[PDB]
Amino acid sequence: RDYEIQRERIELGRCIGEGQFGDVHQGIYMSPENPAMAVAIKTCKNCTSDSVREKFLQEALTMRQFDHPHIVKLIGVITENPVWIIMELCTLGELRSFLQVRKFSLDLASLILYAYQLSTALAYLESKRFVHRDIAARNVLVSATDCVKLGDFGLSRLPIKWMAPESINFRRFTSASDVWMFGVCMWEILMHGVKPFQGVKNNDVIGRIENGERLPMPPNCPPTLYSLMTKCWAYDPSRRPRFTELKAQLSTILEEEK
Ligand SMILES: CNC(=O)c1ccccc1Nc1nc(Nc2ccc(N3CCOCC3)cc2OC)ncc1Cl
């Protein structure tokens, strides 16, 4: 209904990042007779014009469209200077760091669960015909040890090493090129946050992909899950699974691994 929030309900905490328009903070949203809610706050640093303020706020209008357990929610906006966008906080931070730090504490079933949850968020977007374009582990947040979410779409935004050949060669971005990127995101997850094509130059990436090279099978990845990944990386977009297919398959693989 009304997304406008009184600034006095927000307590700005530490800086946790930055985007195009300004710093991102963690903070708190307070309301009478309720517990304080942890939030992320995107700020528009020195936005001293209507055109910049409008470009900033359109990122809120984008997030407002979505209602899914595995995509971060818009809580509200403050439309007086300085303009803030207030989002739900994923308290455990960025997935890549979480996987690196908690590696000897996480099992395969947990990694597969992260992939499944993300696939449900992306199937949801696919059903809305919304193309993400920026699917990578670095854009996934950790809400709890058993819960990951796509981060803010403004903050998520060329990522050559993640991109489908059709996106690199022809600038085509579709749900099918989303599927490719997700394949890479699943590889990152199984590798506990190692980046794809490490030590390889961006301009060389397409040469390798067109030569038929693909990211290798992670250690202790189930063959059935690597097979699903190689399907995501079919050179021909028409041959890749849809996110609807991915979610059903991942559901089966997860059950198998439990
Ligand atoms: C897609 N990426 C994002 O949306 C994003 C990127 C950088 C920083 C914040 C950020 N957005 C969020 N971030 C969070 N939670 C985070 C993210 C990063 C961190 N960090 C902790 C300090 O080191 C850097 C990253 C903390 C945190 O909550 C404590 N929750 C919700 C949103 Cl919408």
Residue numbers in the entry: 413 to 569, 584 to 684
Sentences reproduced from the published study:
Focal Adhesion Kinase (FAK) is a non-receptor tyrosine kinase that regulates signals involved in cell proliferation, migration and survival. FAK activation is initiated by breaking an intramolecular autoinhibitory interaction between the N-terminal FERM (4.1, ezrin, radixin, moesin homology) and kinase domains. All compounds exhibit a common 5-chloro-2-ortho-methoxyanilino-4-anilinopyrimidine core structure, which binds in a nearly identical manner to the hinge region of the FAK kinase.
TAE226 is a potent inhibitor of FAK (IC50 = 5.5 nM) and also inhibits insulin receptor (InsR) and insulin-like growth factor-I receptor (IGF-IR), albeit ∼10 fold less potently (IC50 = 44 nM for InsR and IC50 = 140 nM for IGF-IR). The methyl carbamoyl moiety in ortho position to the amine in the 4-aniline ring of TAE226 is located near the DFG motif of the activation loop of the FAK kinase. Its carbonyl group forms a hydrogen bond with the backbone nitrogen of Asp564 of the DFG motif. The side chain of Leu567, the residue immediately following the DFG sequence, makes hydrophobic contacts with the 4-aniline ring. Interestingly, the interactions involving Asp564 and Leu567 stabilize a short helix that includes the DFG motif. This conformation of the DFG motif, which is induced by these contacts with TAE226, is similar to the conformation induced by the bis-amino pyrimidine FAK inhibiter PF-562,271 and has to our knowledge only been observed in FAK. In order to adopt this helical turn the phi torsion angle of Asp564 is rotated by 113° compared to the active kinase domain. Together, the backbone rotations of Gly563 and Asp564 move the Cα of Asp564 by 3 Å closer to the N-lobe with its side chain closely approaching the N-lobe of the kinase. Interestingly, the FAK inhibitor TAE226 induces a DFG conformation in FAK that is distinct from that observed in Abl or other kinases. Our work demonstrates that TAE226 locks the activation loop of FAK into a helical conformation, which to date has only been observed in FAK and appears to require a glycine residue immediately preceding the DFG motif.
